[PDB]
Curated annotation (Swiss-Prot), chain C:
GO terms for biological process: pantothenate biosynthetic process. It comes from the Bacteria. The active site is at 181 (proton acceptor). Belongs to the PanB family. It comes from Burkholderia thailandensis (strain ATCC 700388 / DSM 13276 / CCUG 48851 / CIP 106301 / E264). It is an enzyme of class 2 (transferase). Binds 1 Mg(2+) ion per subunit. It catalyses: 3-methyl-2-oxobutanoate + (6R)-5,10-methylene-5,6,7,8-tetrahydrofolate + H2O = 2-dehydropantoate + (6S)-5,6,7,8-tetrahydrofolate. Mg(2+) binds at residues 45, 84, 114. This is 3-methyl-2-oxobutanoate hydroxymethyltransferase. Catalyzes the reversible reaction in which hydroxymethyl group from 5,10-methylenetetrahydrofolate is transferred onto alpha-ketoisovalerate to form ketopantoate.
UniProtKB/Swiss-Prot annotation, chain D:
GO terms for biological process: pantothenate biosynthetic process. Pathway: Cofactor biosynthesis; (R)-pantothenate biosynthesis; (R)-pantoate from 3-methyl-2-oxobutanoate: step 1/2. GO terms for molecular function: 3-methyl-2-oxobutanoate hydroxymethyltransferase activity; magnesium ion binding. Mg(2+) binds at residues 45, 84, 114. Binds 1 Mg(2+) ion per subunit. This is 3-methyl-2-oxobutanoate hydroxymethyltransferase. Its cofactor is Mg(2+). Its EC number is 2.1.2.11. NCBIfam families: panB (TIGR00222), PRK00311.1 (NF001452). Homodecamer; pentamer of dimers. It is found in: Cytoplasm.
């Protein structure tokens, strides 16, 4: 299969093919996810929790993201490689650009950063300078009718500024549905219901690595499968046939 | 011959003498290309692919360009030395200037950087500060993840707008990359500065290729816009000679190298 | 359970309880392995292959090991945390000491480094300064270019004798643990018999005091034909936790490695 | 083919298969030389002349070698990758080791450094620590050359370059040693040969260097030129008498 | 208990539950204060005096605050962790942001910095970028050499209220009032929506703060008027801290004798 | 009172006045401890546990010790200021010397480092270059992972004699049976300072936070219990060391 | 006596008590000057000449001033400690602020920097961020190569007029103290009348709120016209400094022979 | 007058002309001391006390000495310029050499460092490499062994600090190089004091030469004259 490109994600939205995204932080899983036809691999600041064992993502540095990005990129996966700009690394457009350049030099093909309409200038600046941008709105880990209105304004503003992808995190299913309808770019949900152009989960969550209470947004795709590969395939398959997320995984 | 200067390239355009440009990244090829009367040598971020074995040009740093620039410069070629500002090094006019200064200290006589009309302020800033600028429009390889250009009527119109804008801001040379031949003819006719084509057809003031491509150092299918000038020549020198002469007599690029 | 210590490993040898060791490079797997009662977690330079996607372990830096060490240590596992000194970081006793100190500040409780008899002074120097040392003899993967690939070691009487000499030397110098890598089962058996410290085998057969595998190997992460000495414990198991428990159980009941995993 | 290893070179010497070595400093040539079955690629301090345009190799730094080493290694050639420790970077065994480590982290599989008998401790130190070593050397002069070669072999060098040595003196060194010898301006009685890439592609002005043949002249491609070199080394036709010391 | 959050402090104000804040600079005291149910722990530049033995807070660096912040954070207290941006580290909004990010990476959950209405741009900049801000008005100790009690005139009190409204409007979610007449602090508290935290500002604030070593009685001779030694006669250091928390919440501290 | 000096400690041993030592890491407590007439204040790598909240002392750096040293020293206490060389900072005599210099520039008057007979060359090197040295034998907490008798007692006495002969002017005995500590003290001429070593030492040390009850370890007493203030707790410690009532048998092996 | 503060200097002008200032660069002289009740100690870039032996003050760095400031501060004098921002360190307001912060961390309580009305924005920026500012007009020695040497300033009608405009602008921007250097006596008298903040003269005559000299000059270690050697004939260095302080306060120094 | 050199000090000893040494840390005092014909100016770690206000000399760094050395040197005094290697900067012969080089690049003409016969190797190493050395010592039997060892190793000057007078006299008689006393009595080849001490800006070893002179220059001249006529130090200034 060909490499997954940013324009390919748009074409998938138009065709109604749901986008399967997962976080990924190393070369062995990059290769495995690619065998399972994961569309987008995300070097996310979630590594602060799942790899570094910190209570929050705030300690994660730009150099941390660059290191795991280089690891994933060395596998040369066909999937689109997206990397987060961590909290504190995009406070001005020039800082955002320097941060993005570092990660793209390391192998990222698009960068993701959290925030609403205030980011519009930053998004425009990056896109103008050939950095593809994934926006991220809703519950943004680095941080009702009125809340839904502001979410929609945020999402429109970052789309208008040039973002070609957007993550919607912890949003009521009906609100996520409206945002998806109103935008032209693909939306990627986590805890946003099934009316999005695609889905994302943290790798370790969907392999059931945790102990005790599973987060509401997550399904353990490993339990009962014959291999880790089959678990990732089952996730991709369930995203694409519309069965994940189910009603029980909503906000 | 005398050193090739930026005014010399302009005079060549006025006189109908086509400009022969090639990428070059070391002192041995700098000397050989100069022996062959190449007019302009380009230390390009193409070295990310051809020298470093990377899949894209994104990893190439300013320090990388400065190193290869110094190598070429130490040969003291008569050709004009142009160096690329790599992606990420010209995001603001002050950053662009600092980047260009580093390369000019190392021996570049002109800097090249990719982008359309948005660059006008950056071009103006550099030119005002005595940095000669080569613009680069069409397919700009640093934009590979954001992305032949100008196939649409609107696409062609914007390319013309981009070329006019960077010329107006003070660019004294412009590369046209992967443009339909008829669109490139229009751009060339409408500008006053010399145009340098790669995959832009023959209606440009001159031509550029990647050195290694035109020496046939690639396996399998050659890129459409390249000719292997090495095949059938007695020497590497004669291959570069053959490229220079074919650019100048108008025989390269042929219709088969053009979109 | 209480924390696994270096003296606990010695007690386990004396009691015939096999030691279960696995590589580990992050906090999530540190926690999971500890739930499964893995005895020792190794921040190994194997991360160069399995995490970084390099063809050999040679590009792995001291800072790389320190980073993954800190991640594992943050989980505060009961398992003993061992970290490799990567290639080029222990060329003199002083350099080895500075390298070990950095990793122990990051949370390692013992350091491991590759080489035979010539390492005696270095081992002595570290042990004297309270750095616990795990030796590593046989196929030492940082010597890949000296060996001309990943070849089984000790296949001849002279190669077997040197391996014994190496093991004896590093033990006498004060190593409290030793890995035997890619050695014929009968050769590993004799080294285990002759030493007093616990031996930990990888591709060394079952007559060692314990066993180690690379985490990703035993989770079956890789496609195609795997090297003989590895076993995928994920197949047939309902969870990643269950796979790791199965590894621990098989090491301790003596069923892993089997003859099919041994040279 | 499988990867060329240090033990493979030794097996080739015993089989009488001559070893073809060439300098190489970038990924495009790394790939082309591999296609042509070059056995060993050398990131050599010759780059100071042929790439950097310096009059001597003295200005070449460790960082320079590491850069071009990384470029070659990124092509993942089957050929053995050898990199020079430049002058000034192996003055003590500890310094030599740190230098070799930097280059092996960057992708080198063996390091090469110039000098005679006095290097024995340095060679032993590196080899003990799993750094493979290529030595480089070249009536009383002949005796000392043979003493240098024996000393570095004894210390653990697994390959040795003989540069600018009378043919019959090189023949004696090759007979006396067990490890493979690699000649440049040392005649044909060596286990193999090395040239600077640019020299053998005819990229020089005017008169060829004495030890060098232009293998490009008359060939249809640069590939064919490197293929002709490899074939000529292996059938014993290069070097000829005109290429002697 | 659950972690104390910024929204929790707002809910406390609206419920009338007084907020107990105390300075803290290390892991043993972080744990002890948390056992005593201190609501907010402050890594304050007061450490320049009480830990470093300097005559003022001006020598305290951003790295000093980051170090003590990391020590407190490693204890993982439920209390909200607030850290000071020291004088000189927030002179422009970009600088203030860079400083705050360093402290939040080290474990701070909110940053505090001193100044009046001129800080409004700076506060807005940080809050928009997800840095929670505690303001600090009145006697701001980094301003010691500019000043040589703040709000003793009608003009002074008016400016204090303008300062407080400005930083609240800009997005500060907490504010310290230091060395303010009791009736003036009461007016500020009434006019603001966010919780006010007093030191030498009387009892009509949403909460109180003291320097740890002051309330543990660590210092000889006449102590400042607005401090009480909660340790004297206590069975343990823990009990002293518990007593402070209870006194704040039941309205026993500060007394009129601690107030101007 | 006059400043407490290394010779003063030796004179105290010979006079039978027990030496009261406590850890201290900041200026406020430096002043309070001085008001209570603590003889010696130790900027110890124990701060890794008590201040930094780490599970062991291994993460504590030379720069960490230097920072706390400067804090104590700025209070200008009369007590002798001793600072630890942390694990990893004294692996060669030259490294040990460089480390000690940095701490003495910051205000330390003597340095302490852990280990036995092997340290003799290091101690000599430092003492010859005018660095006063406190040795530390028995349970050396930097050896936590290495550690996880007639011969043990014999080696400890050998260790103590060796570091004294090399020039150490003070020695900490940690986690040693009371009768074995008694023998070491009798055999040495320099003052011994016990922690979990019983009462037959020339003096005693505890970690400040332990004796203030801010966490109970066997050899520790909470001196805050039953006292009216933090000052009174420190006073009570100094008095009980000096009248020989601490440590008690319940604090000893 | 209590510490001398910036507000205390303002009070002194209003009471008619002349302010005695002297340069000082080390702890021994800091203590001695304090014994003699010097009001203000200046760590001045004059150290480039008197300590470093340079021909001008241009080579003096911010780090140089910070070193000598720390030396003076360690003596803990009651006098106010003022430190110069050297030429090149206050070219933008943010640069001036960073420079001031470094010196205040080191123990300076007020900073001094040279220039006229163009500094207004810089002064405002510093004062707003709680940095106290002493202005310096007249002969500003860092401008030596602009002026073509150490020339008296204010000789022409236009020179004097600009000096007065400069003094007003910097006071209006928030300077709390101002040095007048090498100005005709009548011109300085007019500046002093027109300002409300204290003026401190050097070669500016007696009609200022106070005086400054370089320490080494007034100790007779060198005479320039506006200097008096207060050592010659006294029994000790202490007595010389005491005589200077007394003469400034009784209005007998500077005399007409020291004035332009 | 001509510049004072290391061999000049030796000539002065042979002639019985007492050597007047004073600490100095800046250009203004360097010039004044020179006017008063001070023979040797010492950039000493005493600056930790008298300039930096520290309780001890331990915080003084090599860079601190190099700074004040440059200041003194820029005055280009005729006096020999000697600079201290601080505690901690001469722990090995290689470290001592690197530290001395830094100071000599900054203008020192000789370096001084404290310690007994253990310094012999270090002294020899520096002297071999053209670094002039002033030793510094301060029990009696070992003191002589210390002084002899550093002289044999090549030191060309030595400071004797806090030494009983009759013991200093014996050390001076046994050595060939000049001895410089502070608290060591008058039977040395010369004397040193800290500048601020002898100007009365504050010790048993010290005389305030300022009180009752008409200028600072006159005070320094009085010091120089009293060292040279043998009236300083008096018995009241002894160990
Ligand atoms: Cl480079």
């Amino acid at each position: 299969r060909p490499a997954v490109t940013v324009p390919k994600l748009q074409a998938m939205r138009e065709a109604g093919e749901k986008i399967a995204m997962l976080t990924c932080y190393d070369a062995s899983f990059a290769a495995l996810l690619d065998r399972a036809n994961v569309d987008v691999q995300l070097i996310g600041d979630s590594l602060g929790n799942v790899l570094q064992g910190q209570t929050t993502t705030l300690p994660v540095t730009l150099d941390d993201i660059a290191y795991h990005t280089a690891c994933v990129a060395r596998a040369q996966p066909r999937a689109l490689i997206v990397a987060d700009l961590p909290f504190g690394t995009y406070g001005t457009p020039a800082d955002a650009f320097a941060s993005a350049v570092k990660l793209m030099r390391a192998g990222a093909q698009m960068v993701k950063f959290e925030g609403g309409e205030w980011l519009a200038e930053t998004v425009r600046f990056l896109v103008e300078r050939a950095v593809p941008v994934c926006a991220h709105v809703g519950l943004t880990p680095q941080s009702t009718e009125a809340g839904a209105a502001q979410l929609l304004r945020d999402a429109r503003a970052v789309e208008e500024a040039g973002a070609q992808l957007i993550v919607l995190e912890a949003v009521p299913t009906l609100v996520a549905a409206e945002v998806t309808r109103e935008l032209s770019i693909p939306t990627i949900g986590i805890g946003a219901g099934a009316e999005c152009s695609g889905q994302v989960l943290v790798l370790h969550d969907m392999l059931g690595v945790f102990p005790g209470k599973r987060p509401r947004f997550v399904k353990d795709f490993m339990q009962g499968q014959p291999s880790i590969f089959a678990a990732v395939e089952a996730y991709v398959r369930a995203v694409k046939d519309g069965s994940f997320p189910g009603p029980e995984h909503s906000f």
